[PDB]
Design a protein around this ligand. Structure first.
Ligand SMILES: [Zn+2]
Length: 58
DNA sequence: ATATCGCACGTCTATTATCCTCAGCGCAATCAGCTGTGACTACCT
């Protein structure tokens, strides 16, 4: 069981946990604004992040 | 002997499913910075 950091309700499997190891249930999944997904190139341009920093930094 | 049916000879029209120019992401062309070799030119105390 995984405890959600937003609502506190324990959940077993969720989309956020499965795809990004984020301890948040689908009920609290704010994919609109808080959990918005962006392309790799856009993130690299905005945050000046390199490939290694996105793949090799623990 | 003269109109009439079978045969042929085409020709107009169509009851109906094709080829062009705009989009992220990763490997390669590009560039600033630094240095190495050689001789040159000069400048201060
Ligand atoms: Zn939750």
């Amino acid at each position: 069981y995984v405890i959600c950091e937003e609502c506190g309700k324990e959940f077993m499997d969720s989309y956020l946990m499965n795809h990004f190891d984020l301890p948040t249930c689908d009920n609290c999944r704010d994919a609109d604004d808080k959990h918005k997904l962006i392309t790799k190139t856009e993130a690299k341009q905005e945050y000046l992040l390199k490939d290694c920093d996105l793949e090799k930094r623990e």
